[PDB]
Symmetry: C3
């Protein structure tokens, strides 16, 4: 009568091995139901949500999303939740897929330095979100308290070459996007569902550049995709590919051959991809400003031979991926820390500005600052730049239009304002430009930009 009716646990008790994102535990590879002991510890800690931007995350297992749990339908799971002594808050857990009130919540309340346990049978196959369930629930979830549990079918999932773990969340900082420093949680933005960041795996760039997911032409890739929310619904999409299969939770329905699929807040799906041609495939929330303005992009990078019969074109670059085309933006972290320490050098600024110039400025002005004849004026050896570095701050913040002369040529176009750039970002970008391409050197400070903005 109950699903998952495979008899009492047999064999030996199994201690679950949990993995950190973006990795997944191995398939259970088991033909009998077991007692599975799961131990998960809550840790509150600061981490970088973006370069030079710290946030106090609340985590299951030290990561956002939390550690991945993998069991078999019909297993009896003895769930142990610990809360690290350093925690200020109590925490608990609601696992979707659990049959019982709160998905475990009332029997997993755990004060700092304590441990709780409860037992459940995994009656329901599927991929499922788990999350904290402690008042105020939204604050806990917003601070990163979510992950995935996979309950396998008894026969296991079909074999694939790679399995990965990707989870979207919306985040609410007091400061604006890319404003540096330790950013508090912002309850007002959270209630209004107005996130400052929308991320995969807890940070900007968590899955881009040198942190990309990998596979090779011809391989299959399964991705366990969660949406921790707390509030957003993801228009989840793969740029330049298709999903062979998309299956939500433990649903009977499987959709095949779709590129764009809606993942509810608190939802999860298993997607399958087959690599056909090399290059970078971007996982996004196709509510586009999330993907391109708030951090909601991840990369699956495929290595192998080009097939000109299928696609003649080139790998992605900064025109599309912006400043996440490059391996990383570590120079930005280093410049921000140098500013805090009072040791910020011109070169710290130049290297940070170099990272930030990609896409943001280079789409028009080019990576070498040459511009494009008749269309975009040069930043390289620019007389107009050199003539008035203050004017340049105004141009970045407030745009520029009308006829101008640069290096003896007339331009009569429109540079849109870029007011969303933070003071340090404008300063560092301009300091990069001034110290490149035979420009006159010197520097622009965040304080200089603050004054022009005001």
């Amino acid at each position: 009568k109950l699903p998952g009716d495979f008899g009492p646990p047999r064999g030996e008790p199994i201690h679950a091995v949990l993995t950190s994102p973006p990795l997944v535990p191995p398939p259970v590879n088991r033909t009998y139901p077991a007692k599975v002991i799961v131990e998960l510890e809550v840790v509150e800690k600061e981490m970088q949500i973006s370069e030079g931007v710290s946030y106090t995350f609340w985590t299951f297992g030290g990561t956002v999303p939390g550690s991945f749990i993998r069991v078999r339908q019909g297993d009896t799971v003895e769930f142990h939740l610990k809360n690290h002594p350093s925690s200020k808050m109590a925490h608990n857990i609601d696992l979707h897929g659990v049959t019982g009130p709160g998905g475990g919540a009332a029997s997993s309340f755990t004060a700092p330095g304590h441990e709780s346990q409860f037992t459940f049978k995994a009656l329901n196959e599927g991929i499922y979100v788990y999350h904290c369930a402690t008042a105020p629930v939204g604050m806990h979830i917003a601070n990163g308290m979510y992950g995935l549990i996979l309950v396998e079918p008894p026969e296991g999932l079909p074999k694939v070459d790679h399995e990965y773990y990707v989870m979207q969340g919306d985040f609410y900082t007091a400061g604006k996007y890319r404003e540096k420093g330790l950013q508090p949680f912002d309850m007002e933005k959270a209630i209004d569902e107005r996130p400052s960041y929308v991320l995969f795996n807890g940070a900007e760039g968590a899955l881009t550049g040198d942190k990309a997911l990998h596979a090779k032409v011809g391989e299959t890739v399964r991705i366990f995709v969660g949406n921790g929310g707390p509030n957003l619904v993801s228009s989840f999409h793969v740029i330049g590919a298709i999903f062979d299969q998309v299956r939500y939770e433990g649903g009977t329905n499987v959709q095949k051959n779709v590129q764009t699929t809606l993942i509810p807040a608190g939802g999860a799906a298993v997607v399958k991809f087959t690599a056909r041609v090399p290059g970078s495939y971007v996982l996004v929330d196709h509510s586009i400003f999330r993907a391109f303005n708030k951090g909601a992009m991840a990369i699956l990078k495929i290595d192998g031979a080009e097939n000109k019969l299928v696609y003649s074109g080139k790998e992605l670059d900064s025109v599309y991926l912006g400043d996440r085309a490059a391996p990383n933006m570590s120079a930005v972290t280093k410049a921000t820390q140098a500013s805090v320490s009072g040791t910020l050098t011109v070169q710290d600024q130049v290297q940070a500005g170099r990272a930030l110039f990609a896409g943001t400025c280079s789409v028009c002005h080019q990576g070498n600052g040459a511009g494009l004849p008749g269309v975009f004026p040069p930043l390289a050896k620019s007389d107009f730049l050199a003539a008035d570095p203050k004017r340049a701050m105004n141009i970045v913040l407030h745009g520029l239009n009308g006829k101008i002369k640069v290096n003896g040529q007339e331009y009569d176009s429109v540079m849109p304002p870029m007011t969303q750039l933070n003071d340090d970002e404008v300063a560092n970008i301009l300091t990069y430009v001034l110290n490149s391409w035979d420009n006159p050197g010197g520097r622009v400070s965040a304080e200089d930009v603050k004054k022009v903005r005001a």
Copy 2:
């Protein structure tokens, strides 16, 4: 050629018996098509959207959602809409599932004190939203003008033990969440899709506590779930359970074994649940701040024997459900009315504060005010509280951090601000605390809190 081609109406004309939420009319239990006469009356009236918060609802049949209508595919429906003489606005109806322009709208315009009628054939089986269709349509829908009509398949739906009627809506008050008094509709929040409340069945607590839906272990429950909007899409989810089946409108596709499912604005679904273990199962919009900060939670409470093989844990409490764990919050309504009348007593405040303290404060400070050793300081017989009741107002509104001494013990933690609490709520909560646990008595007034907030 047309669907629902079951011949002319036969038998006798049937006068439809409509039900008020959360109840549903009985199955039609009929093998022939009939002429079904439906009579529905619009009533504009004030009701409580939350305790002590009045709202002028516009209703079909006196409730939000409106009366449930149940007919059989192939029926000829003669639809009579009356508008009560007390109405200020004209009203009409668009029933999804109707084949014809506006779903009835142009032939159901009805001024106060009037009646309109129109006839349609129910060609389409399914569950369908109906709503008002009078300019400005969004205002009408926002004020509560929506419900469900079920068009059964000719053979009927499979028998279940219980059928219930649950409908989500987003609401737009001029005041903030839980600000007392008669709250006007707020057009600006509505246009921006920024609701102050997100509710099931027209009120906070409409389906919680003593108003929960009921069933017993082993029983099946069918829920007709609507989303009246006007604007939100529900990440509709059952905490601690799974839906055996989810079917949208009259779709051919049926999803099985899912826990989280997206319901469009203006959409409807039929979900099935089988009770397996006792306790409270929470229906939520899993865009979490709606569920936990704006009212979007309902309860299906299952009675019966525990099954420790399936779930070893406990029923839900205020850690998860907050102040909706208790049967009701009537003390809040009574205190608010006493304030209006100028008769507010200390005990009125104490009992209101008692209701509001649950979850909101008790998650940390505990239901007996004892706190937790080394972690959360006591409110019970608190020297620190007694020493400066004004400081306590500041602590609730603006939080507290750093080393403090309470009852001879050091704490060095963080109480987050609770600025979203209204002045009366802080006043009543603190008055409760002061009159409990050997604390010194007295009271805090809403005016006292207003001054500290300013």
Copy 3:
């Protein structure tokens, strides 16, 4: 091994014939794979987003959405993107359905006056969004850079009587809804996902009135429905009908017999409708304030015989469709241009006000200004209006309640405020009323209303 494995291209190279919305190219009607040459040109230009409201759109082929492209699964597509010399920005393309990084983006970067090309095989059948992929991607998409490409199955889609092309988008103007003039793109509203317009096919009224889609009773209609976003998810719905079929992208799953269906940002679906009774069927985003307050309504108008057995009622009118019931609102465009030119006459205002009065005022006051006895007072020959035209400006902006006397009769009701109306709209509406129905004439100016609003 790869899908679409139908061999090398054969026959002659085919130059694709692209269509402008809401039309679709003819079925490919071809049994062999071909080399298909597609030429699409980007044009930046001002167009009217609403009457008297200009916007600088960025377009593929001069329209929003862009030109429709129709090919066959297994075709080799040689894609040529041109950027008109008048462009200020560079542009490129990402076609969903393309197998390769960026869906073409890196190999289609095209400066003003240039052309790019790349080749891909259409491995994936389905309906797919294409869009620009140039940093800042959200700005490009927000400015109108999206369209659809259909990749047919090898056997073709089933024949229907009509095929149409409808695409939703969200738009972000600096000014509020219906504020006249050339409206800049508003980055802040875009990041916050707070659109001022939500439209089908690039403009208010693009598919209403004299621009409605057409078919006849008994005919089948296929609509290729895109959602360009950038940010919104459409609760896509047909008022007064049902979709026989809804199929997303190239998915295997087909839903049948649904009225309301969620289309992701960047998503696309093929829907089928069978006309059964005459009248206007409204395609909306059923997040209702979008449909009724921001422009998100389109019409499929069915001609033919009434069938009283199916629906006894009347065609839609301004009670539901508001000011889009009429063929067009050209008088508003003409009045706005007359204001710019300094030649605005009383009659220009009267005719603009006539257009705007429909629904907005007529729902209560009636199309002849008679009101409804005991319920809504007359505007026709209104003593109360004539007595104080300034008071009338205040009534429109700020509402009216309480007992009043009009033409010898008492009213004691509530006219809600209509503060969202722009100054010119109030002026023109009141000038219409004053010059109708034996009212005293004269005029109200936008400046008059500006002063009352302040």
